[PDB]
Amino acid sequence: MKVIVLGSSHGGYEAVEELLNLHPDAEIQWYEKGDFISFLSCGMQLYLEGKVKDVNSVRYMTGEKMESRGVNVFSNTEITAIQPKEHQVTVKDLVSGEERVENYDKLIISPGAVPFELDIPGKDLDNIYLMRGRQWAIKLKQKTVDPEVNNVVVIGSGYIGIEAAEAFAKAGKKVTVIDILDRPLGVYLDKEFTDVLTEEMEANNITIATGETVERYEGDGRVQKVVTDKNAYDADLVVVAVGVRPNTAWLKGTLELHPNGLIKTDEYMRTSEPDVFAVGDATLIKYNPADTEVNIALATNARKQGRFAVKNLEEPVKPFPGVQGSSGLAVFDYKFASTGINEVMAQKLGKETKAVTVVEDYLMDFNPDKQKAWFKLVYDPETTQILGAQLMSKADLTANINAISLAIQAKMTIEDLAYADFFFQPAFDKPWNIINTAALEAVKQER
């Protein structure tokens, strides 16, 4: 049987991995529009910030290694169209320009996304960058050592915009983060966490310009000024980290798209077309916190979906278990993680929640290594079942969030987490740990 896999990023790659496990006898074709197989964009900041020196080491598979395993790898080859009834696709070698058609029995696509760009005047000036993949990683890195970047404005205050801000701020530059949102990281954290992160960012000389609409880019030849509705900001570099467009317009009319380009798929990753499967940033995923489907553009998601697309190749047997949308990141000295519903996700779903925050030393009083840790536990007002949590400390407590991910999944309640057995040892935590204490507080709040 022959199986074509589009994309060598997370969903693409994991579909050929599981093809090699469940279907090791199938003719597999792995296509990649670009020159490099499997770059880890999620490694960009360690490279940018200097901890990883070789940008080609920031990857997790090579074409060659897959070819060692029987996989037909065509990089620099772009699938230009899918003909689903005809069971064929059209590909175009981008280095020679040759067009060709390939037949498939099953096709699995993970075309992913592309940075959203602001269609504002000046949008064509030099030095207005994006942050995704290897060429942007290299170009961005050279700017961190350029003697002429003095001020850089990153537009967008989410995971990526803050990673960029931190990288160029540590690089020695003057960074300003501009965004219409009024809190940095609001998609990930609630106000009681992002105020601490705004002060930590500001101490590292970043200006957080929230509540501002970027109007226009000004400059002569190369960008010189980013001007917003309430201010004009100097800029020798702009990094645009505002959103991701689905890379699906080429599928308009071939497969069924959601009003925002996202490919419609079911629990077994099937598209509206027979024998075409779609996975990764360009799809929705089962969000178990509120029993719904939501787009959560994360590595972890595309990888589990890439594997499930393969499991359901012949027949719909393993429905996707769903995810909670867990994330973790360190912003200068603070390491935070969160999973499930927070203020913004609850607003976006129109889901009413109740919650508590406990900010205290996560180690007992007598232990000299004690530090504040912040934990917020969000639950359902009627069932008190766990809907999400956020934690943050200069001590890395991030692994605690995986527990919360499984409690939400398992529909546990604040009473369950209140007396859940979590180990205590005084060099490691307090007798009722971080999770038990917030839940004990929620219980008390619901007495």
Ligand SMILES: Cc1cc2nc3c(=O)[nH]c(=O)nc-3n(C[C@H](O)[C@H](O)[C@H](O)COP(=O)(O)OP(=O)(O)OC[C@H]3O[C@@H](n4cnc5c(N)ncnc54)[C@H](O)[C@@H]3O)c2cc1C
């Ligand atoms: C800066 C950055 C940091 C991130 N950090 C994290 C993190 O730390 N943790 C985490 O969970 N996630 C992180 N993510 C999100 C994560 O990287 C994405 O969710 C992940 O890339 C999965 O995307 P995907 O496999 O659907 O495809 P994408 O990553 O969008 O890539 C799709 C691939 O398919 C190729 N392709 C597309 N169309 C064609 C075509 N027609 N023919 C042939 N090839 C084609 C593209 O060139 C590309 O190589 C981050 C993303 C970025 C940009």
